[PDB]
Amino acid sequence: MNTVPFTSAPIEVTIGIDQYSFNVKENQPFHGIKDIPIGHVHVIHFQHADNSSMRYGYWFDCRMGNFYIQYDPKDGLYKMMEERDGAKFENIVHNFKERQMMVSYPKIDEDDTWYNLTEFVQMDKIRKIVRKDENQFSYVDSSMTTVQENELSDPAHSLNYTVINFKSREAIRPGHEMEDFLDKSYYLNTVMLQGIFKNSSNYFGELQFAFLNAMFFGNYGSSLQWHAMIELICSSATVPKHMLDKLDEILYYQIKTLPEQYSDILLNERVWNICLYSSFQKNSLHNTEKIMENKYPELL
């Protein structure tokens, strides 16, 4: 179990860690989060009491270093930083724990929710989507736009998701215009899985990471990317059976976890009705279909 200490909390802020969140008052003696499960990626995120705009946060993995949070009064936000002095860091962590100024990552033992949302998400792939290689952690916020969005302005701040576009030469073999547009198996299995992602796990990992960015930051381009990667699979007649079963589990925990009040902006009606009811794979997402019907029948 690992720790992310906080130097201080000078401004009133809602702090999130993975799917959990806490209210912290201006200059409340708060100094970090302990008992963070090793073995998964994590995300620590923030929403200032004074600006319910711009949720922001940091993806990290404690196996890659000792990370802490410090408020920057110039830039006006809680910053993640890396401490390279291992002794000095155990020292700060132990004093704060002794003084008991840290919240515990509140994992119920039965609960596999975070594992299920992050099964395929790997820190090394995140740092290729969020390119900032002087840091081991990755910053994301509400406003960041994707590479595909930029095409249709600042590349340093882009989400480098893989561009999927159903009406592109990449997606459509010459002479198989109709075939490939109605049955995207070629685009999925040869172009995307064998070509770019190399395997199903990296694809699922980018799918899961897009979803979580859309959920935690309301990042609209991430939502677009999540729906695109679902639709590509569902619009393919020929999908490895193992990917279908895993997809049903992935989507089930994402729908389960979504805030009920946000189902209107986060769930594209067309894609979901198409995937669940029209597509080749309409019959292959039984768990996802049951949770969608019993929880958001209106959207359908």
Partner 1 sequence: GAMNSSNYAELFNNDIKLFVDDTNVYRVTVHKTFEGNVATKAINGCIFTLNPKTGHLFLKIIHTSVWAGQKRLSQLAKWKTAEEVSALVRSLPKEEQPKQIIVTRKAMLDPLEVHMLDFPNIAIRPTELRLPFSAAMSIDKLSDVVMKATEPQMVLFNIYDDWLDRISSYTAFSRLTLLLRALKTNEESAKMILLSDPTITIKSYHLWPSFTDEQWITIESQMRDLILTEYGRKYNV
Part of the chain binding partner 1 (CB under 8 A), chosen from 19-27, 151-159, 173-181, 280-288: 173-181
Q: Which is nearer to partner 1, 112 or 179 (CB)?
A: 179
Give the residue with the Cβ less far from partner 1, 85 or 177: 177
The whole-angstrom separation of Cα 64 and Cα 58 is 14
DSSP tag of 199: S
In the set 130, 172, 224, 234, which binds partner 1 (CB under 8 A)?
172
Q: Is 168 in the site for partner 1 (CB under 8 A)?
A: yes
Stretch that binds partner 1, among 31-39, 41-49, 165-173, 259-267 (CB under 8 A): 165-173
Q: Are 275 and 282 in contact (CB under 8 A)?
A: yes
Contact indicator for 83, 89 with CB cutoff of 8 Å:
yes
Instruction: Please report how close the Cβ of residue 166 comes to partner 1 at its closest, in angstroms.
Output: 9
The length of the chain, given as a count of residues: 300
Work out whether strand 32-36 and strand 138-141 pair parallel, antiparallel, or are unpaired.
unpaired
Q: Which amino acid is residue 219, in one-letter code? A: N
d(C-alpha 18, C-alpha 116), whole Å: 12
The distance of closest approach from Cβ of residue 176 to partner 1 in the complex, given in angstroms and rounded to an integer, is 10
User: Binding residue for partner 1 (CB under 8 A) from 139, 181, 186, 296?
Assistant: 181
- What is each CA distance from 131 to 172, 225, 242, in whole angstroms? 29, 17, 31
Amino acid present at 253:
Y
Q: Least distance to partner 1 from the beta carbon of 174, Å? A: 8
Phi, psi of 177 (to 5 degrees): -45, -60
- For 135, counting Cβ atoms within 10 Å of its Cβ (0-12 exposed, 13-18 middle, 19+ buried), the class is middle
Inter-residue contact 246 to 239 (CB < 8 Å): no
Q: Which stretch in 1-9, 71-79, 176-184, 229-237 sits in contact with partner 1 by CB under 8 A?
A: 176-184
The three state secondary structure string of 62-117 is: HHHCEEEEEEECCCCEEEEEEECCHHHHHHHHHHHHHCCCCEECCCCCCCCHHHHH
Cβ proximity to partner 1: between 35 and 177 the closer is 177
The yes or no reply on residue 178 touching partner 1 (CB under 8 A) is yes
Q: By CB under 8 A, tell whether 167 contacts partner 1.
A: yes
Stretch that binds partner 1, among 96-104, 106-114, 168-176, 262-270 (CB under 8 A): 168-176
Identified binder of partner 1 from the candidate list 177, 264, 269, 293, rule CB under 8 A: 177
Please count the residues of this chain forming the interface with partner 1, following the rule CB under 8 A: 7
Question: Of residues 74, 169, 241, 242, which one binds partner 1 by CB under 8 A?
Answer: 169
Closer CB to partner 1, 84 or 169, in the complex: 169
Q: Based on CB atoms, which residue is closest to partner 1, 117 or 172?
A: 172
Sites of contact with partner 1 (CB under 8 A) = 167-169, 172, 177-178, 181
